[PDB]
Structure 1
Amino acid sequence: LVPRGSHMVGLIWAQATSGVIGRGGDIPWRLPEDQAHFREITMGHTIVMGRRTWDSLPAKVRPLPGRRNVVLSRQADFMASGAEVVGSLEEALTSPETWVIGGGQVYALALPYATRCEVTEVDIGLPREAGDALAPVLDETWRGETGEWRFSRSGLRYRLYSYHRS
């Protein structure tokens, strides 16, 4: 459970088996099971994203509904209609439960404060290319639960991981 006086920080991302999460300003696959899982985990909570992840959402869909949207930017003139733009994790992590929803820069920024990671891994061979966004690497303070391989309606294998630490 999450006490209302606490500040719990989780990271949620989907990756190829290579660790790639983003390429050319987008996610280089689509997986409906992952979209549903992302919604199930984050609904009702604050979501924090980097400015480039805000840019990657079509204007018509943002801010993502049912969640307080917070965008990290260092640009004093960047504005996100419907959402709050802050310049640091300190300002972004004021809710009792926050999910950092990407991308690569912001996962690495938020990892020192996080105690949970929820990962979808898609079994698509997408090797790391220059400029890709990548999943954060998790050291031995993290302990993980790895689900068995499942099979999507779209014909891709995928599996879920849940990581925790103190």
Structure 2
Amino acid sequence: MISLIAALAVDRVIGMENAMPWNLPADLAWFKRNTLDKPVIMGRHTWESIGRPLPGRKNIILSSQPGTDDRVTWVKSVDEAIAACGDVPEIMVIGGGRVYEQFLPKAQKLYLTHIDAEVEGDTHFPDYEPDDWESVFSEFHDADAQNSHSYCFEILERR
């Protein structure tokens, strides 16, 4: 089963040049809870940002180029990614843009973070038709002393 996970600002904006101007430790927690013990697939850019492997999870890196770091698994194609995951009950795709795109249609589940933030980004989440998905969980949280903005958690299942 394939599930995408992402943080969306206003207008399906997921990224820009510089780091997103926002502090949401709570988001990282959910991210963490939701992906631990699951293999995670990502792109070269994404991986470059993180800088290290995520622990408690299997990192598969979808890339055309040869990777040196041996602590992660390098792959060249979508099939391979999957193949590299084994017989698990859920594969989590973590981005960025291009991967979300490619894996989007094979996805069956969406964990999404909708952050009330208006920014001018380069990369956007993919467009999916609401029609086709079913909200199974939703939860709003206001900004606070530790989170710079309010946000809402959501889990969409493919209809």
* TM category, shorter: 0.7 to 0.9
Q: Where in structure 2 are there 5+ consecutive unaligned residues?
A: none
Q: TM-score, normalised by structure 2?
A: 0.87
* 1:146/1:159 contact within 8 Å kept: no
CA displacement, residues 66-102 of structure 1 (integer Å, 9 cap, x when unaligned): 0000001112x33344101100111111332210011
1:3 maps to none
Quote the Cα distance in structure 1 between the aligned partners of 2:150 and 2:133.
Answer: 25
TM-score, length of structure 1 as denominator length: 0.83
Q: In the alignment, which residue of structure 2 is the partner of 1:15?
A: 8
Question: 1:22, 1:28 within 8 Å by CA — same for their partners in 2?
Answer: no
CA RMSD of aligned residues (A): 1.8
Whether the 8 Å contact between 1:26 and 1:56 is mirrored in structure 2 is no
Give the aligned partner of residue 147 of structure 1: 138
CA distance, structure 2, for counterparts of residue 20 and residue 146 of structure 1: 21
1:79 paired residue number? 68
CA apart distance, 1:30? 3.0
Q: Which residue of 2 aligns with 1:69?
A: 59
- In the alignment, is residue 158 of structure 1 matched against residue 147 of structure 2? no
Which of 21, 36, 39 is equivalent to 2:32?
39
Which whole-Å CA distance do the structure 1 matches of 2:21 and 2:99 have between them?
Answer: 19
CA distance in 2, matches of 1:70, 1:27: 24
Q: Secondary structure at the match of 1:33?
A: helix
How many angstroms apart in 1 are the aligned matches of 2:16 and 2:32? 22
Q: What percent of counterpart residues are identical?
A: 36
* Separation in 2, partners of 1:57, 1:98: 19
Aligned counterparts of 1:138 and 1:146: Cα–Cα separation in 2: 17
Conservation of the 8 A alpha-carbon contact between 1:142 and 1:163: yes
- Equivalent residues in 2 for 1:99-114, closer than 5 Å: 99-114=92-107
Letter in 2 for 1:70: I
Unaligned runs of 5+ in 1: 1-7
Which whole-Å CA distance do the structure 2 matches of 1:148 and 1:54 have between them? Answer: 28
C-alpha separation in 2, matches of 1:79 and 1:25: 25
